[PDB]
Amino acid sequence: MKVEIDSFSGAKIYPGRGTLFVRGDSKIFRFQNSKSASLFKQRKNPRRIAWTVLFRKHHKKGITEEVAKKRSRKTVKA
Amino acid sequence: SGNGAQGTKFRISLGLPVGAIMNCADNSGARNLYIIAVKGSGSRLNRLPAASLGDMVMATVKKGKPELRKKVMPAIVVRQAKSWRRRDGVFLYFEDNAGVIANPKGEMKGSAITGPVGKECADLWPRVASNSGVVV
Amino acid sequence: SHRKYEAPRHGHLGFLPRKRAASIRARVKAFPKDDRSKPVALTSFLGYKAGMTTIVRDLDRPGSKFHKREVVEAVTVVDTPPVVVVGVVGYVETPRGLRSLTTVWAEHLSDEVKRRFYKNWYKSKKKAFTKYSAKYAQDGAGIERELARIKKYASVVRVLVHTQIRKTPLAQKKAHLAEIQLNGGSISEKVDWAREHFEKTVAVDSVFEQNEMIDAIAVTKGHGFEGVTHRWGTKKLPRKTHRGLRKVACIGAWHPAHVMWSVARAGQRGYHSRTSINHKIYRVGKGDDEANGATSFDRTKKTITPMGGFVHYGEIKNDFIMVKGCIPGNRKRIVTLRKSLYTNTSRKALEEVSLKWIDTASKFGKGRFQTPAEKHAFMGTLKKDL
Amino acid sequence: GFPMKQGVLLPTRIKLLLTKNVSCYRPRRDGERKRKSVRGAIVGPDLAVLALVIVKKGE
RNA sequence: GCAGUCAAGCGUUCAUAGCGACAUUGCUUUUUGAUUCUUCGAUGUCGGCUCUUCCUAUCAUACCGAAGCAGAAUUCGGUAAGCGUUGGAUUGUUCACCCACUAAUAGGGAACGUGAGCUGGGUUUAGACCGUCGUGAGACAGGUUAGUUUUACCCUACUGAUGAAUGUUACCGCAAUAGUAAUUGAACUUAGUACGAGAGGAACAGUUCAUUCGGAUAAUUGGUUUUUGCGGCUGUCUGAUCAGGCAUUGCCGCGAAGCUACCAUCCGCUGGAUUAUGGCUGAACGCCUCUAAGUCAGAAUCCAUGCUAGAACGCGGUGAUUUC
RNA sequence: GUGAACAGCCUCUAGUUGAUAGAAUAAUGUAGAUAAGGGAAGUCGGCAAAAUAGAUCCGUAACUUCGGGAUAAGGAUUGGC
Ligand SMILES: [Mg+2]
Ligand SMILES: [Mg+2]
Ligand SMILES: [Mg+2]
Ligand SMILES: [Mg+2]
Ligand SMILES: [Mg+2]
Ligand SMILES: [Mg+2]
Ligand SMILES: [Mg+2]
Ligand SMILES: [Mg+2]
Ligand SMILES: [Mg+2]
Ligand SMILES: [Mg+2]
Ligand SMILES: [Mg+2]
Ligand SMILES: [Mg+2]
Ligand SMILES: [Mg+2]
Ligand SMILES: [Mg+2]
Ligand SMILES: [Mg+2]
Ligand SMILES: [Mg+2]
Ligand SMILES: [Mg+2]
Ligand SMILES: [Mg+2]
Ligand SMILES: [Mg+2]
Ligand SMILES: [Mg+2]
Ligand SMILES: [Mg+2]
Ligand SMILES: [Mg+2]
Ligand SMILES: [Mg+2]
Ligand SMILES: [Mg+2]
Ligand SMILES: [Mg+2]
Ligand SMILES: [Mg+2]
Ligand SMILES: [Mg+2]
Ligand SMILES: [Mg+2]
Ligand SMILES: [Mg+2]
Ligand SMILES: [Mg+2]
Ligand SMILES: [Mg+2]
Ligand SMILES: [Mg+2]
Ligand SMILES: [Mg+2]
Ligand SMILES: [Mg+2]
Ligand SMILES: [Mg+2]
Ligand SMILES: [Mg+2]
Ligand SMILES: [Mg+2]
Ligand SMILES: [Mg+2]
Ligand SMILES: [Mg+2]
Ligand SMILES: [Mg+2]
Ligand SMILES: [Mg+2]
Ligand SMILES: [Mg+2]
Ligand SMILES: [Mg+2]
Ligand SMILES: [Mg+2]
Ligand SMILES: [Mg+2]
Ligand SMILES: [Mg+2]
Ligand SMILES: [Mg+2]
Ligand SMILES: [Mg+2]
Ligand SMILES: [Mg+2]
Ligand SMILES: [Mg+2]
Ligand SMILES: [Mg+2]
Ligand SMILES: [Mg+2]
Ligand SMILES: [Mg+2]
Ligand SMILES: [Mg+2]
Ligand SMILES: [Mg+2]
Ligand SMILES: [Mg+2]
Ligand SMILES: [Mg+2]
Ligand SMILES: [Mg+2]
Ligand SMILES: [Mg+2]
Ligand SMILES: [Mg+2]
Ligand SMILES: [Mg+2]
Ligand SMILES: [Mg+2]
Ligand SMILES: [Mg+2]
Ligand SMILES: [Mg+2]
Ligand SMILES: [Mg+2]
Ligand SMILES: [Mg+2]
Ligand SMILES: [Mg+2]
Ligand SMILES: [Mg+2]
Ligand SMILES: [Mg+2]
Ligand SMILES: [Mg+2]
Ligand SMILES: [Mg+2]
Ligand SMILES: [Mg+2]
Ligand SMILES: [Mg+2]
Ligand SMILES: [Mg+2]
Ligand SMILES: [Mg+2]
Ligand SMILES: [Mg+2]
Ligand SMILES: [Mg+2]
């Protein structure tokens, strides 16, 4: 069992959910629902649709503590 | 299906009743395929026979080489726009309808299939598995 | 003349009359053949259809193109809190058929069952079974010689059980009562089991186990008055036709000069009693088990109740039977789950199913998240959090 | 047997246009670039071999 | 139109495998005639659509017997009407004829079923063109075009729906009668096996799917949108803003709930008695015979099992049973 | 006011707010809409319905009585600021 993600919105597509589209050039598209699919058919651009992962990533929405510091170094001296 | 069907196609939602026209997706000279029959179909008053992905139809060629027109030959559906459901739970659909012209055995007429192809069909006919590029 | 083209008829004549049923609780008209060599157990159970969801499991079907592959499958879920035994009835055989010889009741009966015996519970003095309860206060002579009466006679023996509807999100307040045939051994051992279980409680797993074929007995969802086209699968008449087209064009030939019992007419639709068979049990969940909805493979702590609850039902909190697919009847309705009437081999039965994953996303919309954990993980923090 | 590629996310395969001084490609010719399949950088059940590096010993 | 009896021929030989002359005996009433009993103070004329039921002279499917049955295919026959018998081009068509699928694409009845059920293409009033005929008006089982398809609220039937009265009320049941349902194909395997000189070339058991039908169901996917739920747009009106009104629901994208689709998903039981037929024992008839007595095996049949209703004038068990 | 407009649609003045009423929203209707995939296979017949549509620019066949055919066909564009 794999969870997919919506090629338009970035929602998790749990098994059985959504629909799958095979474009003529054999690119596969997966939608979580009939909403993302209709935008996709409409030639809407996910970067302009506010509620999408691609939007929020691009517009830098809420990535607050991911670009913070960390502790992942080593120590050997061999 | 019937003859040269190696395996047993699980039931896939019907998309192409008699009179549909699908793109001819091989290299044989034919552009389109007009469906006149569905092999192994059954009878119900007023029901039209309908083809699914991987069914063998009878067809005529409406657009194509003149030596390829005005006569009925077998063909095999390779792509479906009507959605359908697989047993792994997914409802999927191609962007066009298309078959390739075949002989009753199930052997193909042209050398290569010019499109993606559904596995339900790939498994079903060997000589189609050969001639395909991307499957599903 | 003659049809001039042959077609099958419409609808099945072994489901007439298509009238409303006599009751919400369809009737178990058959029980499993008795094998008295086995321990005593129930043969049916009571519960309430709550809802459906999706399942993921590998398939084990040597030969099928989907052997050793995951399939996804719909399932119903019926809320089955413990039943409670409050009586036995004993039937004897006569050349006119099976008749009931005596009931024998528990001494104390829950206000749940007591409510079933009334039509205005608030106004009533609730005198039900009050004099019967007295029959115990003796040594007990009468109840004994009644149980005793059952043993000496009585081809078959049934437990009067009833539901604990108060363990159910329903607003119904008025429990459901029913007789279940006891199929364990030795007619005398049967009433002994019965007598022991007065006011006692009996559990679903004592009647069902995983991968069992069970039948479901219930009253279909109702649809009121239906015209001939939907009620019978008739053909729509042409668009051009005067005075309506969800009709039948020829209600009958001239002779017999009578409309016939076999032709379709607009009538009631739905609310029929049905006996669906062969609904494999995919899961027997325990109420007091957080991670009901979990799996060997999933393992996240979560019950089968979807986000926001089963739509129109609530919040399943008791034990439940998960049944492959769909069941006659609709959500919140009393259903009877009955043992199979034959031992199926089928290879389709006997398949020991192992769930990989039970869907738990909301049904009230386009569910996207199994748990509020999962939800928060993906949205991050919102303007309403800490 | 296709290899992973650092920071090329999506646990799937893609066909990329690679250049000299880049992992999963050793050119044959000056100015040679070749379009080759690659497995993504996100671990998934389809992997035959995970490659790992100890950074802190255990007990 | 369908079926016989005699048996001269046909059938390499060989009357009766399969056919059958000369004759001759019949049945049928979807052929056409013959009649003129009923309807002329009107019983709506051809098809087609839709839908139900029925017949069998069986096309397919189950089980059989026969062959000029080696296998495969096919032909003849029995028990059989349980189940099915289709999609299209031309024609108003019935009929016809091709294309195509299919297990098969059987023939018939029911006021030549079926018009207050439709349709109105044909026929068959009034307009009109042609051809033939006629001095003419006009005529033509000649060709052509346009040409109003009315009413149910009654009774009964049918579908569903209440319901007085056999102390009251309540719960749980029984089961008389009635209905009843499943269907057909393929692939793998058997097996390149049995049989055959070869060319070819099966089946039972096992498995995987499918068609046609049926009963549900709505997790999923699709359709529906007055959620007038959110957003957008035009025109105008409220001084502007905010927020809104009006445009027979203004328009558009998304759209939950509900309803809903072989456009979606799930489910569709196993015992017995029989038919044909092949047999056992076994006389009549010292022999011989499946039959006379007795008897075994046996089909998509039948009766149960199951399933639906529950007799509102069929029934059982059970609870409680009023004091101004 | 929008707009080519005495069109449609909204408004000012004036005039109406008359048409039995209540409650529900079964079948079947009548008038209004939508529908996956296919696309006339429906039917006597595309009957009904759907499609098209304004304007600006490009482009425009046979044939012709030279007047036409012609918005032939076929294309692109159109808001706000
Ligand atoms: Mg939707
Ligand atoms: Mg939609
Ligand atoms: Mg098929
Ligand atoms: Mg028809
Ligand atoms: Mg090749
Ligand atoms: Mg017939
Ligand atoms: Mg007694
Ligand atoms: Mg309706
Ligand atoms: Mg249905
Ligand atoms: Mg009309
Ligand atoms: Mg009809
Ligand atoms: Mg003679
Ligand atoms: Mg001979
Ligand atoms: Mg001779
Ligand atoms: Mg005849
Ligand atoms: Mg007379
Ligand atoms: Mg007469
Ligand atoms: Mg008359
Ligand atoms: Mg008359
Ligand atoms: Mg008269
Ligand atoms: Mg009359
Ligand atoms: Mg009459
Ligand atoms: Mg011989
Ligand atoms: Mg026979
Ligand atoms: Mg019949
Ligand atoms: Mg009969
Ligand atoms: Mg036809
Ligand atoms: Mg026709
Ligand atoms: Mg001809
Ligand atoms: Mg025909
Ligand atoms: Mg007649
Ligand atoms: Mg008639
Ligand atoms: Mg009539
Ligand atoms: Mg009429
Ligand atoms: Mg006429
Ligand atoms: Mg005409
Ligand atoms: Mg005339
Ligand atoms: Mg005359
Ligand atoms: Mg005419
Ligand atoms: Mg006219
Ligand atoms: Mg009247
Ligand atoms: Mg009327
Ligand atoms: Mg082989
Ligand atoms: Mg030989
Ligand atoms: Mg059928
Ligand atoms: Mg919906
Ligand atoms: Mg709005
Ligand atoms: Mg504005
Ligand atoms: Mg402002
Ligand atoms: Mg107006
Ligand atoms: Mg069905
Ligand atoms: Mg059954
Ligand atoms: Mg019997
Ligand atoms: Mg013998
Ligand atoms: Mg016999
Ligand atoms: Mg006898
Ligand atoms: Mg005898
Ligand atoms: Mg049967
Ligand atoms: Mg049984
Ligand atoms: Mg009664
Ligand atoms: Mg009674
Ligand atoms: Mg009026
Ligand atoms: Mg009015
Ligand atoms: Mg309506
Ligand atoms: Mg729309
Ligand atoms: Mg459509
Ligand atoms: Mg088209
Ligand atoms: Mg046609
Ligand atoms: Mg066409
Ligand atoms: Mg037709
Ligand atoms: Mg015509
Ligand atoms: Mg015609
Ligand atoms: Mg047309
Ligand atoms: Mg029109
Ligand atoms: Mg449209
Ligand atoms: Mg023109
Ligand atoms: Mg501009």
UniProtKB/Swiss-Prot annotation, chain A:
UniProt record, GO biological process: cytoplasmic translation; translational elongation; translational initiation
GO terms for MF: mRNA binding; RNA binding; structural constituent of ribosome
Domain of life: Eukaryota
Keywords: Cytoplasm, Phosphoprotein, Ribonucleoprotein, Ribosomal protein
Residues with PTM Phosphoserine: 7
Disulfide bonds: none
Subcellular location: Cytoplasm
Record-annotated membrane-spanning stretches: none
GO CC term (a single one): cytosol
Function: Component of the ribosome, a large ribonucleoprotein complex responsible for the synthesis of proteins in the cell. The small ribosomal subunit (SSU) binds messenger RNAs (mRNAs) and translates the encoded message by selecting cognate aminoacyl-transfer RNA (tRNA) molecules. The large subunit (LSU) contains the ribosomal catalytic site termed the peptidyl transferase center (PTC), which catalyzes the formation of peptide bonds, thereby polymerizing the amino acids delivered by tRNAs into a polypeptide chain.
Subunit structure: Component of the large ribosomal subunit (LSU). Mature yeast ribosomes consist of a small (40S) and a large (60S) subunit. The 40S small subunit contains 1 molecule of ribosomal RNA (18S rRNA) and 33 different proteins (encoded by 57 genes). The large 60S subunit contains 3 rRNA molecules (25S, 5.8S and 5S rRNA) and 46 different proteins (encoded by 81 genes).
Family: Belongs to the eukaryotic ribosomal protein eL24 family.
UniProt miscellaneous comment: Present with 247000 molecules/cell in log phase SD medium.
UniProtKB/Swiss-Prot annotation, chain B:
Signal peptide: none
Family, per entry: Belongs to the universal ribosomal protein uL14 family.
Any further remark recorded for this protein: There are 2 genes for uL14 in yeast.
Posttranslational mods: Methylated by RKM1 at 2 different sites, but it is unclear which are the 2 methylated residues among Lys-39, Lys-105 and/or Lys-109.
Protein name, per record: Large ribosomal subunit protein uL14A
Record text on subunit structure and interactions: Component of the large ribosomal subunit (LSU). Mature yeast ribosomes consist of a small (40S) and a large (60S) subunit. The 40S small subunit contains 1 molecule of ribosomal RNA (18S rRNA) and 33 different proteins (encoded by 57 genes). The large 60S subunit contains 3 rRNA molecules (25S, 5.8S and 5S rRNA) and 46 different proteins (encoded by 81 genes).
InterPro entries xrefs: Ribosomal_uL14, Ribosomal_uL14_CS, Ribosomal_uL14_sf
Localization of this protein: Cytoplasm
Organism superkingdom: Eukaryota
Keywords, in A-Z order: Acetylation, Cytoplasm, Methylation, Ribonucleoprotein, Ribosomal protein
Chain positions with N6,N6-dimethyllysine modification: 105, 109
One Gene Ontology molecular-function label: large ribosomal subunit rRNA binding
SUPFAM superfamilies: Ribosomal protein L14 (SSF50193)
Lineage of producing organism: Eukaryota, Fungi, Dikarya, Ascomycota, Saccharomycotina
One GO term (biological process): cytoplasmic translation
N-acetylserine sites (modified residues): 1
UniProt cross-references to PROSITE patterns, sorted A to Z: RIBOSOMAL_L14 (PS00049)
GO CC entries: cytosol; cytosolic large ribosomal subunit
CDD domains per UniProt: Ribosomal_uL14
PANTHER family membership: 50S/60S RIBOSOMAL PROTEIN L14/L23 (PTHR11761), LARGE RIBOSOMAL SUBUNIT PROTEIN UL14 (PTHR11761:SF8)
From Swiss-Prot, chain C:
SUPFAM superfamilies: Translation proteins (SSF50447)
Protein name: Large ribosomal subunit protein uL3
The keyword Ribonucleoprotein belongs to this UniProt entry's keyword annotation: yes
Keywords: Cytoplasm, Isopeptide bond, Methylation, Phosphoprotein, Ribonucleoprotein, Ribosomal protein, Ubl conjugation
Species, as recorded: Saccharomyces cerevisiae (strain ATCC 204508 / S288c) (Baker's yeast)
Location of Phosphothreonine modifications: 102
Modified residues (Pros-methylhistidine): 242
Changes seen on gene knockout: A mutant confers resistance to trichodermin, a trichotecene toxin produced by plant-pathogenic fungi.
Location of Phosphoserine modifications: 23, 155, 296
One of the GO BP terms on file: translational elongation
Assigned GO CC terms: cytoplasm; cytosol; cytosolic large ribosomal subunit
Record family assignment: Belongs to the universal ribosomal protein uL3 family.
Signal peptide, first to last residue: none
Reported function: Component of the ribosome, a large ribonucleoprotein complex responsible for the synthesis of proteins in the cell. The small ribosomal subunit (SSU) binds messenger RNAs (mRNAs) and translates the encoded message by selecting cognate aminoacyl-transfer RNA (tRNA) molecules. The large subunit (LSU) contains the ribosomal catalytic site termed the peptidyl transferase center (PTC), which catalyzes the formation of peptide bonds, thereby polymerizing the amino acids delivered by tRNAs into a polypeptide chain.
Crosslink feature (Glycyl lysine isopeptide (Lys-Gly) (interchain with G-Cter in ubiquitin)) location: 38, 135
UniProtKB/Swiss-Prot annotation, chain D:
One example GO MF annotation: structural constituent of ribosome
Compartments reported by the entry: Cytoplasm; Nucleus, Nucleolus
One cellular component (GO) term of this entry: cytosol
Domain of life of the native organism: Eukaryota
Main location: cytoplasm
Record cross-link Glycyl lysine isopeptide (Lys-Gly) (interchain with G-Cter in ubiquitin), residues: 57
Biological-process GO terms, alphabetical: maturation of SSU-rRNA from tricistronic rRNA transcript (SSU-rRNA, 5.8S rRNA, LSU-rRNA); translation
Keyword terms, alphabetized: Cytoplasm, Isopeptide bond, Nucleus, Phosphoprotein, Ribonucleoprotein, Ribosomal protein, Ribosome biogenesis, rRNA processing, Ubl conjugation
Subunit structure of this chain's protein: Component of the small ribosomal subunit (SSU). Mature yeast ribosomes consist of a small (40S) and a large (60S) subunit. The 40S small subunit contains 1 molecule of ribosomal RNA (18S rRNA) and 33 different proteins (encoded by 57 genes). The large 60S subunit contains 3 rRNA molecules (25S, 5.8S and 5S rRNA) and 46 different proteins (encoded by 81 genes). Interacts with snoRNA U3. uS11 interacts with MPP10. Component of the ribosomal small subunit (SSU) processome composed of at least 40 protein subunits and snoRNA U3.
Family listed: Belongs to the eukaryotic ribosomal protein eS6 family.
Note from the entry: Present with 66000 molecules/cell in log phase SD medium.
Protein name in the entry: Small ribosomal subunit protein eS6A
Lineage, broadest ranks: Eukaryota, Fungi, Dikarya, Ascomycota, Saccharomycotina
Protein's gene: RPS6A
